[PDB]
Each structure stands twice: as structure tokens, then as C-alpha cells.
Amino acid sequence: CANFFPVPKDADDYEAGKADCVREKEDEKGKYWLSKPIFEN
Amino acid sequence: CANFFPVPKDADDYEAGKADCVREKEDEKGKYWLSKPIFEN
Amino acid sequence: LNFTPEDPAEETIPADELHEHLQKPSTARTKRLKERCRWKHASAGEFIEKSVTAGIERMRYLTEAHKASEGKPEAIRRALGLANVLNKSTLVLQEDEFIVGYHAEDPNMFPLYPELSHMAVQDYLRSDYSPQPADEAAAINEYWKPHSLQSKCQPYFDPADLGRMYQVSSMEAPSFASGYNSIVPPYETVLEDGLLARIKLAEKHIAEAQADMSTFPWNGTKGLDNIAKIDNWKAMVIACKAVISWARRQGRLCKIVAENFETDPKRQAELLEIADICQRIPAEPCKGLKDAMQAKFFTFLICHAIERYASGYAQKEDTLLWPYYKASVVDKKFQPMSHMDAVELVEMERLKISEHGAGKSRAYREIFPGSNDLFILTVGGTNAKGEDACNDMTDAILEAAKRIRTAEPSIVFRYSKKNREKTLRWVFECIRDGLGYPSIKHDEIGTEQMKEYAKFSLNGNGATDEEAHNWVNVLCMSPGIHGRRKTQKTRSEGGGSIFPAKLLEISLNDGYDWSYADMQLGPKTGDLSSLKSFEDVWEAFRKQYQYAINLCISTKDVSRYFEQRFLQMPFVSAIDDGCMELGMDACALSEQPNGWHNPITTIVAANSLVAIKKLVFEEKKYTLEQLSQALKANWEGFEEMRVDFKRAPKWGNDDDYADGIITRFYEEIIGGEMRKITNYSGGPVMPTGQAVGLYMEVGSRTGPTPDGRFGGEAADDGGISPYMGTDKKGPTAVLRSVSKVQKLLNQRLSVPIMRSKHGFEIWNSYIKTWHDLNIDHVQFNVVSTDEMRAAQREPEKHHDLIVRVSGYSARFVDIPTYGQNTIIARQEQDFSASDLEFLNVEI
Amino acid sequence: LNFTPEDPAEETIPADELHEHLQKPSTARTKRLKERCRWKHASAGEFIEKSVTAGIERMRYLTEAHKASEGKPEAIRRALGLANVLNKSTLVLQEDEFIVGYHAEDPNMFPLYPELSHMAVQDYLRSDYSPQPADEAAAINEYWKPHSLQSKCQPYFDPADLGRMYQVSSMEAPSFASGYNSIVPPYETVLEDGLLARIKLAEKHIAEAQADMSTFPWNGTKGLDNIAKIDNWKAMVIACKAVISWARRQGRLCKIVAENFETDPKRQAELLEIADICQRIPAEPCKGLKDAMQAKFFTFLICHAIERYASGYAQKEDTLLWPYYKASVVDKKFQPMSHMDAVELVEMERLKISEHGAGKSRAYREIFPGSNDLFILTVGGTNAKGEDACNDMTDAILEAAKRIRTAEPSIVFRYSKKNREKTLRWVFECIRDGLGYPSIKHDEIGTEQMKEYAKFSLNGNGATDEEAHNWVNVLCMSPGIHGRRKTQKTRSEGGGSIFPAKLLEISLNDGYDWSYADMQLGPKTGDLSSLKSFEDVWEAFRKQYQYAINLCISTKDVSRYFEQRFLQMPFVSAIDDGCMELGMDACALSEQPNGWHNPITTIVAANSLVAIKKLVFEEKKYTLEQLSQALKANWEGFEEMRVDFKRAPKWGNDDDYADGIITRFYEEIIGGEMRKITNYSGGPVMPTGQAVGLYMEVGSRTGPTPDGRFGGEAADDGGISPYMGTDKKGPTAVLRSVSKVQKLLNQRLSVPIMRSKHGFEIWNSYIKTWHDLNIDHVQFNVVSTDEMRAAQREPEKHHDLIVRVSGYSARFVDIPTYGQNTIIARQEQDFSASDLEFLNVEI
Ligand SMILES: [Cl-]
Ligand SMILES: [Cl-]
Incomplete structure (x- = not known):
């Protein structure tokens, strides 16, 4: 479920090799998404 | 040269198993003594 | 009809x-x-929803930043702490949501606050809701212990006195020990100006302060004032820049999901609208209702959860x-x-x-059963x-x-x-x-x-x-200014409870609480024999009340002292016109005083005193020893005596003998002695006739009283509301009773x-x-x-x-x-x- | 005859x-x-004795205590730091000594101070005298870097300005960067009262402050003042108790050596006398001369070496x-x-x-060749x-x-x-x-x-x-109160140097120092062409002097700001009647102002200005371009021009044209503009006509001047002493010249x-x-x-x-x-x- 999304170079939080790890999850309540900042593994 | 001297129980700095390691040394200038606090090796 | x-x-x-x-x-x-709905309310010391547990990302990133910010000014360290939390935190986006954002790494979770109370975090570590991994959290709580607000306030109080407050019987525990807090956020500044504008203001003030420090001739008696200002303004910039980036990273999540995950074209277009909102807000001024509602929620998250806990x-x-x-x-x-x-x-x-x-302590989840937070x-x-x-x-x-x-x-x-x-x-x-x-x-x-x-x-x-x-x-009872300025920034300013019913009970036992804590709760004001006249029991309660209320306010002011020095809130400071103008911290600057404190179970102790004066000192029907014996027996014997004390003239019966004592009891002792105390803001501490659910717990924490109550029989209906099953003249009479107090x-x-x-x-x-x-x-x-x-x-x-x-x-x-x-x-x-x-x- | x-x-x-x-x-x-004698003096950046090197025990035990004292009030942390150093330090006793004690683990060594200047310790790490083990010392210096006094003062100054001060050409480097310091210890309090008495005083003050904080009714606008006092008094107790124990452990060493090591019955009996002295002193008041001399030395060690470095x-x-x-x-x-x-x-x-x-930096061992310390x-x-x-x-x-x-x-x-x-x-x-x-x-x-x-x-x-x-x-030149109170506690109050000769040289080069630093040393006050009248070169030097002196005093006051907040001296505070009475730190309380600063090479720049006014603007013999060309050529050409500028009316020749300018130069610019500055103590900053060996170094740091000097020809004989080989009317005439200045x-x-x-x-x-x-x-x-x-x-x-x-x-x-x-x-x-x-x- 781990999907890497490179942070745009014009973003306020942009750093070298930085990316958003967006993972889709779903429990008994409903579906949601989690975005965690990661640096090129 | 390492000589252990147990710190008296009435001393301000007295702690359990505390002692003064008094060693005599002498260089080209003259003789002197060094007192280092040690805790039962 | x-x-x-x-x-x-x-x-x-x-x-x-x-x-x-x-x-x-x-x-x-x-x-x-x-x-x-991911409900977060709890009952009987247990969350209703099964997935509710504590997070650790806030504890982790706050700890990392604190170690790395050593040596720097505390205000800046606090800004860097918030920044690190916001920058590295996992963001959450759920389905059907239009108002987005969260204060933890998981929508079922809640952050904790080791920088506040060590005991509070410790209790969660010893619970089924401990942050994971439990060992890392334990290491984090141990690191923060000497830096905690609790550890900084405690040395300036007798450990015996603090133990009396920790019993929560006559006095509510100090906020530095519980971590409990309140705030009135200056939402108006965020929505109207936006965060970018606040940054520009702070940056301009910094350049002016630096220019002043390099201005000939130098004056060491004045020029050094710029140091605290520059530190504060720099912290405001760091904090604001982090929130903007945090909000825009939240928007980027919406864009990503709409472009790579969402399959419904309706929701996709909606997420793109939300993405545009989070991008502009709260960096730019709000222009529409959707912007305003999103800004307000973002601001709520920072001021009440992320920067600091605030109920x-x-x-x-x-x-x-x-x-x-x-x-x-x-x-x-x-x-x-x-x-x-x-x-x-x-x-x-x-x-x-x-x-x-809410990352609030367990002790404040019991007083409000079935609720998430106030x-x-x-x-x-x-x-x-x-x-x-x-x-x-x-x-x-x-x-x-x-x-x-x-x-x-x-x-x-x-x-x-x-x-x-x-x-x-x-x-x-x-x-x-x-x-x-x-x-x-x-x-x-x-x-x-x-x-x-x-x-x-x-x-x-x-x-x-x-x-x-x-x-x-x-919160529940007290008034306070809202707007761009002069708003209350901390519970240290106003809030907390005292219980006269407990003060009176121990007044008849030489300051010893036999019913609940089974310990010395107050000063040795004297035994039953020393008390020879009604004027002595009036002074016995006085000294008990004076001692109690003094600890209640002193502990809040001491907390206030260290809150502005080590628990700075640069974001709140940035959105306050006062703080931004004067370059001061939100906890430091206090332009509008609001020192309140809550006398709960006041009527219970009030009615009891009337029954004491008439039956013991006036009619001499019973001695203080027999009455004390009747109380310690929980009315097992002395049944004719119990119904006689309840029979005694009470409050709300238009009784001159009864109302004449209560009036003198409220204006001289409860409100009089309390007004004598001045808090941090230079204002007096005035009472609040109310009861924030404490009566259910305190009523079980107070013993039998000469008003007719048994041991643990809880309680007063409200802060001024009549006792249950005592109003017998209709609902209009209840209006007649409450209106008497002018000096819930x-x-x-x-x-x-x-x-x-x-x-x-x-x-x-x-x-x-x-x-x-x-x-x-x-x-x-x-x-x-x-x-x-x-x-x-x-x-x-x-x-x-x-x-x-x-x-x-x-x-x-x-x-x-x-x-x-x-x-x-x-x-x-x-x-x-x-x-x-x-x-x-x-x- | x-x-x-x-x-x-x-x-x-x-x-x-x-x-x-x-x-x-x-x-x-x-x-x-x-x-x-274990001489500690040095020459040509090298110690005369071969065994002289830096110790590490102070760095080690100060670091250990600092890590363990996290969260505590800084004053107490500093007391615990001193305590840990004193408690664990190796003590030294030498033969034939009657006055005993030392400030390092080895009689050939000297402690270092990572809590002061990071650069200073760094230079010793890169030397043949680095503390051992070198890796541990490097780890210690890195840990202290963000906590150092240097790192706390630097952010509040333009890095460009600090670089100009670090050149040490027109301005002396700030004390927070060098670690250099001075103090006047209240010896009188130690000898008369003893340390036990000071502890009793502090303890009494604490109990009174605690009693006040628990006194009904509480006043949050006043009661919180006791916090800083209690912290200070507690630190005084910790510091004093450590010194007493440290002195008595020193005495125990004498007893041990006399009973187990010394073979001469004369020396044995003597060491027993010294043992009795160290036992009573400085815990008890001094009763004899031997007690007094030992107390004074002990007190000297703490105030000038162990608690903090102070030249x-x-x-x-x-x-x-x-x-x-x-x-x-x-x-x-x-x-x-x-x-x-x-x-x-x-x-x-x-x-x-x-x-x-002396654990002083290398840079302050060069200015005083052949010496240990001042x-x-x-x-x-x-x-x-x-x-x-x-x-x-x-x-x-x-x-x-x-x-x-x-x-x-x-x-x-x-x-x-x-x-x-x-x-x-x-x-x-x-x-x-x-x-x-x-x-x-x-x-x-x-x-x-x-x-x-x-x-x-x-x-x-x-x-x-x-x-x-x-x-x-x-130190060398400036006066200061001695006694039990009102004594100077830091170099931040008074001390430091400025060099008008360098200010004048760069005044003729648009603030650019071409001779030494080869960089922009001052503000762009204007080029040679912009300067059309003598009134312009008088204002060019003025702005150069104003800018320089402002940095000199501001850097000391900023240092003072952080010295009292992070570099508290609880021992010095304990032996000061003012600090003990008011519960303040030695660096915080400043009852007797003493803001001095040293104008060195003043006469050199003074004489040069006279030659400029007459030969360039009055007689128009040479333009400013030719004079600047003559200087930049180091008088290679223009020999008839050089002897003509030296021929110009100088100071000390009873010349109305010359003395009339110098008088106006000293009372308006050198002393006038400098008096306009107010320091931390609320007093003015007044000049000191003197030269603390800087002229030998600064003279090699200053270029050729229109007074007849070549490039690097050093220097002025003293701070007001006539130039070498210029006094030609006898020693009595030298008395006539110096006495002219009334406003070494x-x-x-x-x-x-x-x-x-x-x-x-x-x-x-x-x-x-x-x-x-x-x-x-x-x-x-x-x-x-x-x-x-x-x-x-x-x-x-x-x-x-x-x-x-x-x-x-x-x-x-x-x-x-x-x-x-x-x-x-x-x-x-x-x-x-x-x-x-x-x-x-x-x-
Ligand atoms: Cl409220
Ligand atoms: Cl001096």
C-alpha cells in the first residue's frame, strides 16, 4: 500500500529526495488516507 | 603507588565505600601528592 | 390548552x-x-470505540526537536518543537470529509503531552491505550520528566501541601500536575489577516529591534529589552511558517488522493476544492465561509491539541x-x-x-462520563x-x-x-x-x-x-473576552475548583479528613473541645478556607511563571495583536485579567452551618461531640437527630435566621476572603457559582454532613441549584432562591x-x-x-x-x-x- | 654628590x-x-616549562553535572556544576608548601572553560597542550558549544560586525568570544564570617521566602519574586557547602601524607598544622594570619579559576x-x-x-610575552x-x-x-x-x-x-571598589580596548583596512574625493569611532545579559553582602557602576590629525590622494614628505595649534562620544588613558600614519606616554605633557x-x-x-x-x-x- 509521491520543488516543505508516502487504509468505520514524509528510503 | 584511604564517616564528603586514592609522584621539579576520590574500585 | x-x-x-x-x-x-463517526467519548475509564488509543508521533518529534534545540532561547525551542511536529507528522484524510485535518498520525488516536505532566503520561503508559512502541514512549516520558511543567512548579511548594491537593477532596489538583488547560484562541486574526501577514509583521519588528540595538549611542539599561522581543518574534515566524507548510501538505494529500486513489469524479472535484482551500488558508486571508471554517478548525487544532493541550x-x-x-x-x-x-x-x-x-488525563475522563472532552x-x-x-x-x-x-x-x-x-x-x-x-x-x-x-x-x-x-x-461557566487581542491564553489565569463542604467537614475534625483521604487534609485549627462558641467554628472554617484557596491560586500563578518561560506558545502569540505588538509570549502578556475559581458544594456547607449554630450553640440540644459521633457513624444511630438537622432552617425557604447566615457566609468568607487574593494579572480572584460535574465525584469524596446527607450521598444539583427533592414550591420558587445571590x-x-x-x-x-x-x-x-x-x-x-x-x-x-x-x-x-x-x- | x-x-x-x-x-x-617553582609563564606561543599542559577534570566533571542537572534552575545547575568539580577533583599537595591548594588535577596543568568560549577550547584542542584524552575533550567541547556564552551572544549581532571585532585591529574582540574576564573578589566576607555563616544566612532567607509564598492572602504580582531569590540562595548553599568540603578534603590530604608518606618530623608537624587550618578555614572565621592567607588563596582559586576564569x-x-x-x-x-x-x-x-x-586563550598569551597571567x-x-x-x-x-x-x-x-x-x-x-x-x-x-x-x-x-x-x-589600569559589597564581578562591567589609530587609518580609505586585515573594517564614510574640507575628516573619524565604540559596549552588555542567566556565580554571590541580602546573582546585581574602556594609541591618531589639517587643508601642500599614496607606499617615496609630516606640530610641544586640536579631539570625540553610551549598570562609559601591552601587537596591526610612522613601527610608549625618542626636554617635560589631559x-x-x-x-x-x-x-x-x-x-x-x-x-x-x-x-x-x-x- 506504500506509494511514494515526490514533493514538488516549489513546495514550502521541499527538501532533497523528500516524498509523501501515501497509503490507503480502511477499518470498520470507513476509508482514509495517510501521508508520511519520507526521505528516499 | 595507588594507596586507598577510606573516607571517615564524619567527613562532609563521606559516602558509602568512598576513599582517597593517594599517590606519591616526583618529577624534575620536586615531590608532590595526589588525592583522587574513588568508590571501592 | x-x-x-x-x-x-x-x-x-x-x-x-x-x-x-x-x-x-x-x-x-x-x-x-x-x-x-469515529467517536472518542469514554465511559467507566474505557473508550466506547475499540480502536481508540494514544499516538506517539507528537511525543517523538517533540523530543527529537528538544534535544536538537539545546542552548537556543526557550521561545524559539518551543517554535522548533511545534515545527518538527508539524513537518514530520503523518497527515490524515478521510472519506466524505470537507473539513479536513487531524492532530495525530491515526484518525483513531490522540497525542500525548510529556512536556506538561509526567504523571499523566505515566498513567497512559500503564494503560491499555499506551502509545506504541511502549518502551520508546517510556524513554520519552523519562527524558521529559525534569523538563516537565510539573517538575518545575513542585519545588516551590511543601510536598505535604501538594499531597493534600492531589487527593482532590478539598482542593482541585494544580494544572501543572494534571496537564489540564483552557484557552480562548484569537481566531479573528487568522481569518482576517492570514499567517503570511503575521510573519511579515514579526519580521519587520525584528529588523526594527536589530536596528535599535546597533543605534548609537547604546543604552545598556534599555537596549537589552530587544533580546526577549527578537526571540519571541523569531519564534512566531518559525511557528507560522510551520503551520502554513503543514496546512499545504494537508492540501497536497487531498490532491494526491483525488488524482491517484479516489474513483468518484464528484469526490475528486471536491478534494481539489479542498486542496485549493488548504493551499491558501491559513496563509492568506479568508474570503469565503469554506475558507473560514477550515481556518478555524486548523487554528483549533494548533491551539488546543498540537502546540499544547487545551480543553x-x-x-x-x-x-x-x-x-x-x-x-x-x-x-x-x-x-x-x-x-x-x-x-x-x-x-x-x-x-x-x-x-x-483528546489527550487529556484519565482523572478528567471520570468526572465527565460518556463524553470526549468539554x-x-x-x-x-x-x-x-x-x-x-x-x-x-x-x-x-x-x-x-x-x-x-x-x-x-x-x-x-x-x-x-x-x-x-x-x-x-x-x-x-x-x-x-x-x-x-x-x-x-x-x-x-x-x-x-x-x-x-x-x-x-x-x-x-x-x-x-x-x-x-x-x-x-x-469553558462551562466563566465568561471571557474573544477577539484579536486580550483573550485568555491559559487555565492558570482562571479556572479550578474548591469544595467548602469538605472544608467544613474537616473543620469539625481538627483539619483531618476521616471520611475520604483518611489523612490530615487541613491545618490543626483545633479540636471539638477547644471550640466553645459558634464564633470559633466560623473561624475554624475560615482558616481552613483561607489555607485551601491560597494554595489554589498560588499554584496557578507559579505555573504561569514557568509557562511563559519554558512552555511558550509562539503560534498563539503570533495571532494576538498584543503579543505581536509588544513582542511578548501569550502566557507572559496578560492585558485582560480574568481570575476565576469555582466554589463547588457551597450550599451544602452553608446549610450545615445553620443547623450547627441553632442546635448546638443556641439550644444546646446536642454537643459537638455527639454530632461528630453521629457523622462518624454515618447516621446509623441518631435517626431522630438526623431528621432534626435536616428539619433545621435551610436556604431557599425565605428564613431570616437561615438566609441571614448564608448571606454573611458568602460575602465574608466564600467571596470576601477569596477577593483578598490577587493573581498574576493584577486582578482579584472572584467566585463562580457553578458545578462542572465535580459534584458527582466530590459528592462521593465528601462525607456525611449536618444538612441531612449520608456518607457519599451525592450531591448538590448544581453550583447554586437546590438539593434534589428539596424544592417543593414549584419551578418558580427555584428562580426565587437563586436570585438571592447577587454579591448554574x-x-x-x-x-x-x-x-x-x-x-x-x-x-x-x-x-x-x-x-x-x-x-x-x-x-x-x-x-x-x-x-x-x-x-x-x-x-x-x-x-x-x-x-x-x-x-x-x-x-x-x-x-x-x-x-x-x-x-x-x-x-x-x-x-x-x-x-x-x-x-x-x-x- | x-x-x-x-x-x-x-x-x-x-x-x-x-x-x-x-x-x-x-x-x-x-x-x-x-x-x-613550577613556572607557568609562556613565550612565543610556547610555555617555558616543558610539563605545562591543559587538564581535563574540570571539563569532564562540569559536563557530567550539566547533563544531570537538566531542568533545574540555571543558578542551581551552576552550583551543582561547581560542586561536582570540587567533589571529584584530584587534589594536589607539594613539598615545602605551607599555602596549599590547586585548580587542576596536576600541578603542571591548568583547567579549561568550554562553558565560556568554544573557539578558545578549540584552539587548545589543536595544540600541543590539548587536554587528554583528546577525543573526550573534543566531545566535551562539542556538547558545550550550543550552551557556551559565545553561542548565546552571537545571534544578536551582525556576523559581519563580529568578524570586524575578531580581527582585533580597530576593536578588541568581545569577552564572550575570548573567554577573557576580570573580577574583584569580596575576600573580606570570607575571612571575617566564614562560609558556614553564609550558608546559615541563605537558609534563613529561604525559610522566610517560603513562609511568604504560603502567606495569606497570596499576591501573584509580588509573590512570584521569591522564586528567583530561593533559587539563588539555594545555589549559594550548594556552592558554599562544596568549597568547605573541598577545603577539608585538601586538609585530609595533608594529614594522610603526614601520617603515611612524609618522613621528616618537622614537615609532618607542619602538615598537621596546615590540616587544622584547612579544616577550619574557610568554614569558620579566620583568627590568625595563616588562616587569612589560606582563606584568601582558596577564595582566589574559586573566583579566578574553578567557578569561572577571571584574569x-x-x-x-x-x-x-x-x-x-x-x-x-x-x-x-x-x-x-x-x-x-x-x-x-x-x-x-x-x-x-x-x-x-591560567586556562586563558592563546591570543591573550601573545600580547603579554614572558608572562603567566596579569x-x-x-x-x-x-x-x-x-x-x-x-x-x-x-x-x-x-x-x-x-x-x-x-x-x-x-x-x-x-x-x-x-x-x-x-x-x-x-x-x-x-x-x-x-x-x-x-x-x-x-x-x-x-x-x-x-x-x-x-x-x-x-x-x-x-x-x-x-x-x-x-x-x-x-587589572592594570582601572580603579574599583573592594570589600564585602559593591565590588566588580565581571569584565563585562568594565574593560576592553579601542584603537583610534586604526580608526583614523581606515577613515582615509572609506572604512577599508588595507594594511592589516585587508578588508572592510568600518562603514563607508566616504572616499578621498568626497572629503573636501577638514570638517569632513573630523566627521569621518567620528562615525568610525561611534560605530566602533558602540559595538565594544553593546557586546559587553549582551554578554552581561546571558552571564547572569546561564553563567551564574553562586559562590561569589554568597560572599557578597548585596547578593546575599537581595537574593540575586553577582552578575545580575550591580550596585557600584564601573564602566571603563581603554583608548589605546590615542596620541598617535591625535598627532596625525594635526599634520592633516595644516599640510592638506590649510597650506594645500599635498592633496589627500598624495598622502594616501604616500601611506600605501609605506613611505618608500615621499621622504621629504614624511619628514615634513613628522615636523608638523605635535603633542607635548606647548604648541597652541597642536594642543588646541588634541584638546578638542579628546573632550568631544574620544571622551565625548564615548560618555554618551550608558552600560548595564546605568553609569556612563569613561575612557582610561593606558596601554596594556596591546601597543606592541596593535602597533604591528596598524599601518603607517601621517605622524611619521612607517608600516608596523610599534608603538606609543604607553597609553599617554610620549612616542619613543620624541621627548627631548628631559624627564620633567614628560611630566608636563601628561598633566595636560585632565578631562599610564x-x-x-x-x-x-x-x-x-x-x-x-x-x-x-x-x-x-x-x-x-x-x-x-x-x-x-x-x-x-x-x-x-x-x-x-x-x-x-x-x-x-x-x-x-x-x-x-x-x-x-x-x-x-x-x-x-x-x-x-x-x-x-x-x-x-x-x-x-x-x-x-x-x-
Ligand atoms: Cl469556565
Ligand atoms: Cl584595569
């Missing part, structure tokens, strides 16, 4: 399940959102959001909406709050010119409450006779549905209390006469007359009379006993039944059986023809 | 080795102690030790001694100081009633100096006409032996400067008219007339005249050129030859050849019959 339901559909609906057919979500989306939801929401409601709904200049669109939006807000997991917003009231403040945004707020039917957030309505009828009807709709809110506060009374406190301003910049109208409930009212109304078409007129007539009697507060309970009993038998069929407990509302089925039976037992009051004439009704 | 040596034994002693037969130790013990030895030793000299020698009440016993004791003190390894004590002067303060303790101090002949410590004698002749003769004995000390300060001038500063006291508790007589030299004098006297029986009368006559001319300072050099030349050829035969360099004395053979030739080149002045009439002599 006939009490038929105004809606003919309710004629066939069984009375034991009336409130299961009242909810009516404006859209299908909010209907889904309530069904799948509450204090705000003047209608007045605050109105310019953006107007731009969107009325003028349709930006983000064109209908009134129903605004109703849906507020519905979604109530749900986000319902999903807001979220109280304020609407209505008057503007600067004393004119009506009610508008269509007010109605939208109230309609959304009635529709979605969530126990939280609760609402406070400031009632003035200037208030238009159309809004008042919406207020009635929520009450007639038994929501327990909006509770009603006296507008003029609160406004005057803002003017009084304004006089004690240290910098002479208290609230003006116009600004005094801009007040809200800080719980009431239960009958369901049939309220669900009828004549309901509003009768209710409105009561409110108008209530306002004329100068009563400060009043809340209403509209629910039949049969429905509550049916909820006890078949809880799975009564999930939407909401009742009013104390200062908050909760789902009846999420309340323990012991707690349920307490609320049920209260008698439903009816209005006679004599009562209607007293209210000056007109049908 | 005949200049034969007063001692017939000197008739046969070769003149090129006279000073090799002058030393005469009072006992065999002190003779051995000088021979085996200097400021004290009024004769007045300070007199009550204990009297009890021992005169009255023989306790520790009965002869006068010679006191002489031997002071001899031993001078030797302990000679063995005191140790300057003060004797003589007047008491509170203006009467003579000289006594037999004064003479004992002076005799011990003459006997033992150590370059350190140097002595300052406050001269008044009230001073008895017997003491003055002892002063002459040290001078006639060419020691270079005692230097002579004007008693009344210094006393008046204490009265003036007293007016600016922030708490209105400056030195009284009686207390103004109680002053000493802080170096002099060389002839050996034969001074070693004769007529020496004292001639010298005394000079001093009496010097005092009447209101000259602030004067020092004398009595040494023949032949002996210095012989010391250059055969250094191993001239070890005891001592000469006066600048503000200190040093062994001639321990001075580099380049430095030696500079001192030798100075012409020996002789007195004519006309000079004797001017001095009003009487033979």
Missing part, C-alpha cells in the same frame, strides 16, 4: 423512543458521516464566521453557498469535533453598541445542532431582550429536542464582569466598554408541553423572567423517564438519546448504570397557574 | 650582572621553592590581611608570628601565584577618613617582593602625601631593584572616580564617600643614582611632584643596557633579571629577542639641575 405534538407524526411515535426519530441530517453525506472550544462562532457567511451565502462574492450549505458545513464541524481525540461554543448576545448580535449564521449553527444531534460540542447562548425571536425559536428547537443545549447565560451580567476586570489591567489596556460585549464562555441552574421541563405548538411561548416567557431575576446561568432537560428506562433495558435501540448531565451533554446509553439512575431520579417540574402569572405569560 | 652604591658589596659586583645578586629569600624553604588578582591586600597580621604578629592572640614569618608567608604566596596555571594587587592608599592606610603588613608585602624577586604578581601602590616614609622606602626598594613594581597610582584621583560612579547606582546604593577610599586596580607613564631612571644612599630622596621628590601634577599612573624601569645585552648573550647566567614591559613585569630572558630589543632601545632619562628645581628637591 391541548398538549398535542406540533408535528402530527409524533402522535403515533412511542414516547419511550421519541428522540430516536428526531435526527435529520441535511444531506446524505453528513448522514453517512454520523454513522461512521474547550471557546469562541463567538456566529459573530466570528458572519463576515464569511455573508460573503458566501448573502452576497455570494466568493464560494457561493445556500443557507443549507452552511448548515451542512456546521454539521460536518460538529462531527470533526466528535472525532477529536467543547463549549458561544452564540447570540449583543454587539459593541448593545444591539442584537443574532444573525442567520447563528441560526445555521443552531439548526445544524438540532439536525445532526451530537452530544458535542455544547452551546452557550448569551440571552438579551434585544435578541430577535427567529433565533430564539432555533434555540428552543434544540432544547425541546432534549439536547440539553444551548444553555442560557445572562448577557449583561457577563458584559459587566468584563468591564470590572478591565480596571485591573497592568498595562491599562483592558477591554473597553465596547469590547466588553465581546465575551464567550471559556438545572431545570427539567415536561415533554408534552414542549413538543406542542404552545411550547415556545411558555419557554420564552420563562427566559424573559429568568433574565429579569438576574440569574447568571440556566440549562434545561426535556426527556421522559420512560424513554430513559427503555434505554436502560434496550440500549441498542436508543443510541441517539441525549441527556444533560452537568455542564455538558452526553448519550444516555454511553453513561454507566450508576450515572443513569442519578439523572433519572430527578423530578420533572410542572408549571401551575400561579407560576404563569409570576412569569407574566400571555397566550 | 657621589653616586657610589649604598651597599659596598655592589662595588665589586659587575654591572652587567647586578640583578643576579639581589634576590634574598627569607628562609631556606622559600629559596628551595623558588628554585623548584587578575585585584585586592587591597595590606588592609585586607591587617586585622589578621595584627592578631598574629602584633598581639600574638592566635597563630603567633614574627614579622619575618609574615614576610616568608607572602613570599610563599607569590610563589603559589607563580605556579598558578596578577595585580593593590597596597597603600588612604582609609575612610582620608588618613594613611600604610602599615607593617604593607611593608611585609613589599619586602617579600624584593626578597623573592618574582615577576608575578605585580603591585600597585596608591600614593598619597599621607603615606608614611617607612612604607615608601620599601616601595623604593622594589623599584631600585628594577622589579618594575610597585607602580604608582594617584590616590585622590581614583577615590574621586569612585564617588562619581556612585551617583549612577540603580538601587541608590553606590559607594559612600568613606567607601570610595576602598578602591583597588581591577613609563619612565626609566639611571641605575647608579638609584643604588646609592641618595636614591630615595630623589625618587620621593619625583613622586611628590608627580602627585601634584595630578598624573594618574607612573611606573619605573631601573636597569642598565649592558646587563640586558649580557642577558641576550648568556641567558643562562641572567635568569633573575626582571624588566618592566608594559603593565606587567617579566624575566628578560623569557622574552623573545624581538621583544627584548624593543625594551632595550628606550633611552635612559637623566635629571638635570633645572629638573631638580622643578621637583622642589632638598638634599
